[PDB]
Design a protein around this nucleic acid. Sequence first.
DNA 1: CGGGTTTTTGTTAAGGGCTGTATCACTGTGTAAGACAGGCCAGATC
Length: 78
Amino acid sequence: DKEEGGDVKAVCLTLFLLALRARNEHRQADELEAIMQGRGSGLQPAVCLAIRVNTFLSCSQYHKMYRTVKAITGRQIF
DNA sequence: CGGGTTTTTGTTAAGGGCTGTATCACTGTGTAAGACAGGCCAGATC
C-alpha cells in the first residue's frame, strides 16, 4: 500500500521468484513464470512425428511413452 | 538549452552449482559365381 498501492500480487510473485533463483532453482522458477501466463505448452504433430522418426522409435514404444507421460503429468505434451 | 533528482545497469575484489560440449576409441553397411589357360586321357587315324 505504501509504494505499490495494493499490488500484493506482483510483489509477492517477484519475491518468490527471487527466493527460487537464490537457491539455484532456475527450472522451477521458469516453469512458474511460464504457467503464470496460463498457456498450454503443447507440441505440433509434425514435431512429434520428426522426434519419433529421427530417434528410431516404433509406434508401440512411442505409444507407451505417450501414455506414461499423459498419465503421470496429467496433460498432453505429445 | 542546463542543475537537481529519479530510475534501471555495470561491476570484479572471489567462490558454488547446474548445464552444455569436446574427447576417446571403436562400430555397422560394402560378402557368389563366371572367365580362362594349362594338363591329361579316350580316341579317330594314315
